[PDB]
Structure formats: structure tokens, C-alpha cells
Design a protein around this ligand. Structure first.
Ligand SMILES: O=C(Nc1cncc2cc(F)ccc12)[C@]12C[C@H](C1)Oc1ccc(Cl)cc12
Ligand SMILES: O=C(Nc1cncc2cc(F)ccc12)[C@]12C[C@H](C1)Oc1ccc(Cl)cc12
Ligand SMILES: [Cl-]
Lengths: 305, 298
């Protein structure tokens, strides 16, 4: 029993964190085999950030301008290249702690663990979700750039995010490990603002199924809804449209609890209308949207209470 | 910016997790140097009588794909200590520490000696933890990290009828009035950790959430009458002293923030949130707030 925002154990990622220094800037890098991956803005001055020409800044650099530190050991840089917004530093030593890994690009609504680091030293781990507006509500201070997001299903680490910047509203933007940004963001200090965010509907439904699994049904009702009527109502509360893909994905949780997806959709409609009335669901007074259908199945028991 | 329920990096603890099997029971053990620590209920009660009938070879200890050989066994309170023939080469610098209610720690939840997740939690005033554990989680541990030293503070033993969890320190002493057996046990009425709620209100102010601030101040006596009425733990002069740094950073005196908390307790939030929460959060200590708003590394 119980339901917590759970992160993956971070050990396999901790053994990959390094410090990258270029001039006066120090940030974090990810050391996998003989390559260190880090945000390309490590080569920028603050002035450069308004309109940086990364190709022009990079051509003026040599291997010995990049200082890479792994624990108490200095790694020697023997090559460098840029791939989109990521800098790849070839080093002379392969990481003996390199786990089994993949680079995966995730979609909005997907969750992942973040290992927040400063000076190549891990400080904490937390669970989060890629928002529909492509930002993440993280907890990052200056020096956290290069910190990574990942999932660990089985013994393989799937790296999905690398931290690049904080937006004016306090939310965070970054790239996949191939250096492609999530969202319409640029690694440039321009007027960039996150689009209006929405609630991840399929995740709220998954979390309502988790509440039923743990033994709570106060919020259920005797009604059903069509998918289109559900979407016309939920969009009035800034909820993401629920697609047939989301309904198919919720199939297993529907079969486990005996509650049809569209009947759980009717319960969500009523919750949006009435609020909780002094009650909580899994110890929360808000409808939680940072647990996916996959996270609920992984964390919850296979036997409904 | 941002404020998340953050756990310590779990790597140093992952390298200590093993699987302990005794008969039909499989649970988790903590391998430090040449000793494996695990709940004594793995042998299940008259624990001395059950233990005397066991030999070293009855305990199967598995570390990854390797079987460790048990060469000795002893009991210390509610913890079983299995002497093994191999010292853990991944043993970090560590201490066994007993924590107090209100203090927080990270839990590495394990099943079959394999870590599955990490989360942050607090020892409730009623000595239970609101964790997330299924069958097979027994022996999972709670810890904090200071510099490079792991301080182990909790080992999971059982789930109570309300879905909350109970366990011991690493010396086998239970937190709370609990016993390790299948019997009628209930957690006492819980209370809110007042000093932690105040720390979280200071974290909100540091992050730009100031709507709850007011011009008023109060006294410890007046506030404690309000806290007692709303099932909040009493606030002591020690708690006020501990909140000193956050008070100096934000310019809001502790009894000034207490007057804000009193108004939140008597009027609610009025459709508003604080750090994305509609409830007053009590699982961040004053130290956790200072650490997350400073970036301390290990
Ligand atoms: O946003 C940035 N760094 C921060 C990342 N996360 C949390 C932060 C919290 C802070 F209070 C400050 C900077 C943060 C900065 C560092 C300065 C701005 O130059 C930059 C150049 C390029 C890019 Cl894409 C980003 C940045
Ligand atoms: O409480 C227990 N185990 C569980 C620990 N955590 C989460 C659990 C979640 C569950 F759904 C079931 C058992 C859990 C049990 C195993 C049965 C009861 O015999 C016991 C004897 C002594 C002790 Cl201290 C504990 C137990
Ligand atoms: Cl995805």
C-alpha cells in the first residue's frame, strides 16, 4: 500500500556525471564510453547568449580549451564535435562505469527521473514529467546545466533529457541526448516564454485508477460519457484532449479494476465540476498528472483492495 | 527555481542491497563489510527459540548473481546479523543513526535484493512513515548522506492496517510502539509537523509565493493554542531558533510566519496554492529547504 512520486535508483547515472569547464563556465557532462556529452552553451560568454554563432565560437576552440574532471581525475579531451545543441567531447579514457544505455526522445506526458548535479557532483534525485508545453517543472539552480533525465526499465538506462535553461516563469527547458530541444526553444537568451500549460488527462485517469487499486472509490458515479462529450468538458478546464490511443493504453487498468475508461472519464468530469469537498485522493487535494499508466502499473499492487 | 520532494542520490546504498532467503521467505538485506543486516522476522514468535534451530546454511544470501556464504549469525534487538565470508567491496563510509519524528530521509525500495525506486519521506510524529511498499519490500532502508558518509536510519519491517509503514533503526530498535509479529497493531492519531510547514512556507517565499504574508505577528503561547486546536505539533523555542537563518534571509520573523500559518489554518487557501500544493506540506525540514535552495553536493 501507499503511493509516492518515485524516482528510479540513480546509481547507474551517478557513475557517469563529470564536470566540464570552458573558460569561466563550469557545468555538468555525461560520460558514456569515451564521449562526454554536455550543453553546447558551455562555449558561450553571457554576451554571446543574445545571438550566439556556435559554429564560429567552436571553430576557435582546441581540445585543450575543454577541462573535463571525473571525481579527482582530469580526463584528456582528444576530439570535439557539435550535434544540434549538444557538444560531444571525445576523451582518452572510456568510462569503466558505463551502464547498458540508450538515447530515447520522449513525448509530452511521459515521466522520468532527474539527477540534479553541480560541479559534476550529484546532489539529488526527483521524479518529473515532460509537460504538454514541452517544459519541465524542475528544481534547478545555476550550475545545474547538463544534469540529465532518465528511465531505467530492467538494467538499461534510457537517457531522455539534458538540462539547458530556465525560462522566466521558473520552468525548465532542455534537449534529448542528440541535442534536439523539446519545444519551440532555442539555446539563446531571447524572448522565449512557455506556451499555456495544460493538465495531462491520461495521467490523471491513471492516478484515479491507482486510487481505486489502493481501496478508494468515493469519487466514482453512476454515469458514463462519450469520448467527444468528455473532451468538450475537459478542455474547458485546460485539460489535454483524450485520444483513442489514451483509451487503449488505459485498457489494462480498466480490466484490473472493472471500471470502463469512459466511466472513469465520467468520474473525472464530476471531480472537475465539484472539487474534492475537503477530501483527498492518495493524500492529495489536487488532481495529480505526473504518473503515467505505465508508472501506476509498475508501482501499484496487481490485486485491487 | 522550483521546489521538488528530493531524495539523496541512491548509488552508495544500491551497492549494499542483497536478497536474503530463509525457508519460504525472501526479503532484502543490507551488506556492509562482512555482515548482512535484515529483519529478524525472515526466520518466521519466540525469536531465540526459532533462531537456535537454524544453521548458517539455512540462510541463502544473494548479491547480484553471486551467492554469499553465511559463516555466522546473531540477533540484535529486531535485526538479524548474518556474518558472511566476503566483505562488500562497495561498502561506503557509513554510520548507523537513530532519527527523531519530523526528520526526513530517503528510502531505497527493493524487492528480491534489487532496488526499484527511491523516494523522500519523513518520520511522522506517530512514528510511522507514509511509504510505498508491497510484499517483498521488508529490509528496504532509509538513509541520509552528509558529504561522502551514508547515515542509515531506517529498515522496513511491516505495513499497518491503515496502509502506513513501521520499522526499526539499524540497531533493531523500533520507531514507535510496534512489535514484529502478525498481531492487532494500530498507529496512533497523527499530527502535522509544524516546524516543517513553516520551513516550506519560507521555501515558498524564497520561490516568489508571498500572497499568505501579512503585517501581523503573534507569540509562541498564542500560536501553540491554535496549533493544538488544528492537530499541529507544538512549536518550541528550539524550532524558532532552527528557523533563524530562513527568517534572516527572507526578512520574515518566525512568529510573523506563525501569524500567516494561523490565518491559513483558520481560513484555508481560498482556491489558491503554495508551491503547487492545496495542502500545507510538512515533509521538508528547515535543513532540506536550505539545502535545496543552495545546491549541496555529495
Ligand atoms: O538558464 C540558465 N541556467 C540555469 C539553468 N537552470 C536553472 C537556473 C536557475 C537560475 F537561478 C539561474 C540559471 C539557471 C542560463 C545560464 C545563463 C542563463 O546563460 C545561459 C546560456 C544558455 C542557456 Cl540555454 C541557459 C543559460
Ligand atoms: O507487514 C508485513 N509485510 C509487509 C510490509 N510492507 C508492506 C506490505 C504490503 C503488503 F501488501 C503486505 C505486506 C507488507 C508482514 C509480512 C506478514 C505481515 O508477516 C509479518 C510478520 C512480521 C512483520 Cl514485522 C511483518 C509481517
Ligand atoms: Cl514517450
Amino acid at each position: 500500500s501507499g503511493f509516492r512520486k518515485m524516482a528510479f535508483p540513480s546509481g547507474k547515472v551517478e557513475g557517469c556525471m563529470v564536470q566540464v569547464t570552458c573558460g569561466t563556465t563550469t557545468l555538468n557532462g555525461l560520460w558514456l564510453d569515451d564521449v562526454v556529452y554536455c550543453p553546447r552553451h558551455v562555449i558561450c560568454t553571457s554576451e554571446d547568449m543574445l545571438n550566439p554563432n556556435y559554429e564560429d565560437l567552436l571553430i576557435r576552440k582546441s581540445n585543450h580549451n575543454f577541462l573535463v574532471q571525473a571525481g579527482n581525475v582530469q580526463l584528456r579531451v582528444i576530439g570535439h564535435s557539435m550535434q544540434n545543441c549538444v557538444l560531444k567531447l571525445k576523451v582518452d579514457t572510456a568510462n569503466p562505469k558505463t551502464p547498458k544505455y540508450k538515447f530515447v526522445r520522449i513525448q509530452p506526458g511521459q515521466t522520468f527521473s532527474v539527477l540534479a548535479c553541480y560541479n559534476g557532483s550529484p546532489s539529488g534525485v526527483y521524479q518529473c514529467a515532460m509537460r504538454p508545453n514541452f517544459t519541465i517543472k524542475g528544481s534547478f539552480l545555476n550550475g545545474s546545466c547538463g544534469s540529465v533525465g532518465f528511465n531505467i526499465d530492467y538494467d538499461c538506462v534510457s537517457f531522455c533529457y539534458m538540462h539547458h535553461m530556465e525560462l522566466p516563469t521558473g520552468v525548465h527547458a532542455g534537449t534529448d541526448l542528440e541535442g534536439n530541444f523539446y519545444g519551440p526553444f532555442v539555446d539563446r537568451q531571447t524572448a522565449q516564454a512557455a506556451g499555456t500549460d495544460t493538465t495531462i488527462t491520461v495521467n490523471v485517469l491513471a492516478w484515479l485508477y491507482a486510487a481505486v487499486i489502493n481501496g478508494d472509490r468515493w469519487f466514482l458515479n453512476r454515469f458514463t460519457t462519450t469520448l467527444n462529450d468528455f473532451n468538450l468538458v475537459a478542455m474547458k478546464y485546460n485539460y489535454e484532449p483524450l485520444t483513442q490511443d489514451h483509451v487503449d493504453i488505459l485498457g489494462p487498468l480498466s480490466a484490473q479494476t472493472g471500471i470502463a475508461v469512459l466511466d472513469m472519464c465520467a468520474s473525472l468530469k464530476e471531480l472537475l465540476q465539484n472539487g474534492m469537498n475537503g477530501r483527498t485522493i492518495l493524500g492529495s487535494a489536487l488532481l495529480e498528472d505526473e504518473f503515467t499508466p505505465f508508472d501506476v502499473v509498475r508501482q501499484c499492487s496487481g490485486v485491487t483492495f
